């Protein structure tokens, strides 16, 4: 074996120029795609508000134009998937994961158009789902497309270009280049076997994607939270405590998304029509609550500044947590196209500040700021449920830029994954590819 590795040690990182260059174009397309998707979600969201002003006296009629406007776009997105591409429901990260384990196709000729348009319907109606879900699966399939159209052969090329696509997807959805690379390296690579994924190439496309976004998105941060205070050593144990509660809740939240997947299938039975009207009902509740109580609906990125700044009561904070747990399940367990990441960031922060609020009142000697605990709980449900702590950590850091808090973010994150494991939880993307693979055999 020894002489074989002196051979291979000397051949390390020599990615084929063909794959390097193609990973450039994959990154550029996923960029424009994600940018396109983002502006479409935004534009539908504004026109629905401009409807609520055409109708701003008759509060009953207003509440109805709320419901119907989201119900329609919801259905349209629901319908697009079950008629033309059912593997584009939900997040789609798990599908792209199976594509890398070579047990699931990448039907780009169908998914790109349905996920894009079907997502815009459901996201642009204001249901609580993230841009991530669409972009990442849109980006993988743009990888597969670029592969087939140039007919590049070999296993490096297929798994690389599909990784670099799903990477550049997440990066473009969050403006987080490092988080994109770390997300495939930590979570999306095939996890039980060696692989041929060039990470120089993943890096090449992530760059391209991030510049694409920057061209059409300069000026404005997804999440502006300002520079918070520091964490004294003698306050660190408080974050390990915050971790443990994330690490018991983490698995319970997974239980709920899985059981509510079951529970909602019992409603429509699988019937393409009762399903699409069930999604019209969910969409419309979200567009109604969008008007009636915005902190319960939508992706969640807006309340993140407010909650970190301490500008919510704890009364309101408990309201939003229960409420957003509920809309989050109903939206993501129903199968609508749309990610689970960005609502898990919001869910996380609000619980985080609520801890900090209690913690501030209990130890004035610590000179706490209730908002640092918010930053440390943002990627904490990502750690406890997705079991991608290193990705949540760098994702939260890329978005909120308070590096002075890296230690407490780590400490809450590790405690989340640690108690997640020791409590008996399973990685949630893994536990649903599992189930779609478990039926993709139990029908034989």
């Amino acid at each position, epitope marked *: 074996r020894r002489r074989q590795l002196i051979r291979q040690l000397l051949e390390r990182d020599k990615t084929p120029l063909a794959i390097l260059f193609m990973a450039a174009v994959v990154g550029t397309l996923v960029g424009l795609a994600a940018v396109a998707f983002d502006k479409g979600v935004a534009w539908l969201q504004n026109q629905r508000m401009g409807a609520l002003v055409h109708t701003a006296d008759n509060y009953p009629l207003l509440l109805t134009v709320a419901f119907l406007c989201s119900a329609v776009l919801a259905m349209f997105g629901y319908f697009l998937v079950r008629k033309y591409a059912p593997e584009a429901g939900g997040s789609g990260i798990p599908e792209i994961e199976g594509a890398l384990e070579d047990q699931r196709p990448v039907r780009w000729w169908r998914v790109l158009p349905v996920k894009f348009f079907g997502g815009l319907g459901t996201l642009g109606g204001g249901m609580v789902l993230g841009r991530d879900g669409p972009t990442v699966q849109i980006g993988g399939n743009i990888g597969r497309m670029v592969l087939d159209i140039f007919r590049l052969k070999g296993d490096e090329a297929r798994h690389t270009l599909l990784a670099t696509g799903a990477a550049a997807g997440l990066a473009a959805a969050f403006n987080a280049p490092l988080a994109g690379i770390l997300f495939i390296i930590e979570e999306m690579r095939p996890q039980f076997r060696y692989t041929l994924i060039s990470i120089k190439a993943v890096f090449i496309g992530v760059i391209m994607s991030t510049i694409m976004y920057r061209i059409f998105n300069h000026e404005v941060a997804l999440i502006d939270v300002g520079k918070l205070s520091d964490a*004294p*050593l*003698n*306050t660190l144990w408080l974050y390990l405590i915050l971790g443990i509660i994330f690490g018991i809740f983490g698995p319970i939240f997974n239980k709920w998304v899985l059981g509510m997947q079951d529970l909602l299938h019992r409603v429509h039975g699988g019937n393409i029509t009762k399903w699409v009207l069930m999604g019209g009902a969910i969409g419309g509740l979200c567009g109604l609550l969008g008007f009636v109580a915005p902190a319960t609906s939508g992706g969640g990125f807006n309340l993140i500044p407010i909650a970190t700044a*301490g500008n919510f009561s704890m009364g309101m904070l408990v309201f939003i947590f229960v409420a957003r747990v509920i809309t989050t399940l109903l939206c993501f367990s129903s199968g609508a196209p749309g990610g689970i990441f960005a609502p898990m960031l919001a869910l996380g922060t609000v619980l985080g500040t609520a801890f900090g609020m209690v913690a501030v009142e209990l*130890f004035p*000697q*610590y*000179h706490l*700021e209730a908002g640092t605990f918010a930053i440390a709980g943002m990627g904490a449900l990502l750690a406890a449920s997705i079991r991608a702590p290193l990705t949540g950590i760098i994702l939260v850091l890329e978005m909120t830029d308070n590096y002075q808090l890296i230690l407490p973010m780590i400490i809450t994150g590790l405690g989340a994954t640690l108690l997640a494991q020791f409590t008996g939880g399973k990685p949630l993307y893994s536990a649903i590819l599992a189930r779609t693979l478990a039926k993709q055999e139990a029908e034989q």
Partner: antibody
Amino acid sequence: EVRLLESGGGLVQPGGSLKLSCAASGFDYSRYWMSWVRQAPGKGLKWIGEINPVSSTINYTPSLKDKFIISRDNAKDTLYLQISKVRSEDTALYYCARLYYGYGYWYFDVWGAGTTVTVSS
Amino acid sequence: DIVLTQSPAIMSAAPGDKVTMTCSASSSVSYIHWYQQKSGTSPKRWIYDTSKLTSGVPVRFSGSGSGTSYSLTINTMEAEDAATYYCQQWSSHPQTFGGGTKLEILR
């Protein structure tokens, strides 16, 4: 260097009120908790209160309602203390301080020269 | 709240000689600080977290303690060590100083 300059102390008649001032130079007066400690005629140091850089937190020592009122104007880089209903117990050299920590056990980092308040008829 | 009581409320000692102050707390306290004060001038931070000197404070000075008894000592005293040394706590809220001990030259 770092400079803390208190003004505003003088003679006050009992039951009156005053407003002492503390002017900060040589450092970013934001990012720091500020504090007030007074030392009575020949006795020990006693903590009045403190204010966080954003004025979202203001904690006082055990003592009545409008007692003292700490406030800060990071725009002009000065810290304030209003005392009301001044009794003779309030005759004291009043110190302004900047707070910090090491392991997280907070301490009184840099102090000013002080001002004296005499309350007397 | 915590009550710090410093031991030799007042005391003299000759230069080049080893002195030792005490700080004794009603309940338990962690990482105590010590301020030197000489008349007419603001208190100075001297020793913080039970043990660490401030940048400038010469190395003769030192402190140590745990739980409920703490101390400051001056291996070789100078003449300029004449001042009042206030121990102070913030392990608990609210924070409390001690009474002080004044240290004067002996001649």
